[PDB]
A paper describes a structure:
AppA, the Escherichia coli periplasmic phytase of clade 2 of the histidine phosphatase (HP2) family, has been well-characterized and successfully engineered for use as an animal feed supplement. The E. Coli periplasmic phytase, AppA, is a 1D-6-phytase (EC 3.1.3.2) and initial hydrolysis preferentially liberates the phosphate at the 1D-6-position on the inositol ring. HP2Ps catalyse the hydrolysis of phytate via an obligatory phosphohistidine intermediate. The catalytic proton donor is found in a second, short, conserved motif with sequence HD positioned such that the aspartic acid residue functions as the consensus proton donor in the catalytic mechanism.
Numbering used by the authors: 5 to 410
Amino acid sequence: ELKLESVVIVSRHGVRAPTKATQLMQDVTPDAWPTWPVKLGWLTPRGGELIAYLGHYQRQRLVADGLLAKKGCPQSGQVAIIADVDERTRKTGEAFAAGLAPDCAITVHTQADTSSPDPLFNPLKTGVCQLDNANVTDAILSRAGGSIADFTGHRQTAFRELERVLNFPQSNLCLKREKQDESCSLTQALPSELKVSADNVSLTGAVSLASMLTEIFLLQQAQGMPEPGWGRITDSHQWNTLLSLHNAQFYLLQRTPEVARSRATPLLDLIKTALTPHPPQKQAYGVTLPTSVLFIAGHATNLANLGGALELNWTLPGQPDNTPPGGELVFERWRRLSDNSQWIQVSLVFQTLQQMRDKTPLSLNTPPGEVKLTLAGCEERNAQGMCSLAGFTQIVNEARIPACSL
């Protein structure tokens, strides 16, 4: 019924070491954090291997869909790869190429200067545009339930689960409060406030600490470390409860449209140019678009910003982190043969946490997880839930913030 014509994959980098090692992380647990085999924030060898599995799966699937050849290397830009300048994203691009097309040396393009941020992955970071402070503040606080106190008050069960995993009552932070005849809970020892500036939003205190620590536990598990969370995370309900704090921070800081639309604008522009039929032309990064497959190696924030800007909702069965390492927001252009009309499908492809833990090789018989998505604002849908190319184009043009384009 339909023929696949083009694919654009926006991927988070693979498993990485923690980005920070703070005094506060030391003070909230009596136990020692496991050390990592690479520098802060770098991709681990295992993370690259897990990304290569997704590349191998994508080759098999795209061959089955008739888009790539079964053997040989894709020719003359048929596959293109763009990566953010960070080590973890560049190495993810290389790992994906290695799995998709081994020994084909597909180029991993970055911006010219790899020592400075690339605004494609966040235009706020280079001052291309600025957030509206008042509108962002109100929108985030409303989505929090009206206040950060309301947000944390509804999540006490999850904070107590994190405290149990940390052995928080025996930590230096708690023991000093016990000497001050004070009880000890994460949220009240570390009050959380929303900080909004023209270039960034963040939360302080227990909310941001919890988001980062629960991701670390997930990374330990995906890395194959013997005892993530000191052996105190023993079932899937516990994993899901812990990562709910991480996903909740992303819901506030990265999915809120007042942030997401600006932050995702350059990616929206690149995705739409990649998906729109047009005479092929070399554009950003020296990549000729449109082409058959474009893989973009970015960050969890990019996935969440695109989801919020495009009204794409998901949770990932078997994967506690909604923006997991190697997770892929996959945009596809399909041609309907009955009338040769053009349609856009979006899905979220991901390894389950068990597939990461077991280092499961992926294939058509053992595929990654996949959640089919819908663009909530699409008014022209087909029976398969896809949006017409015209409807997708209208959604993107409404979502994007012109001042944030490159």
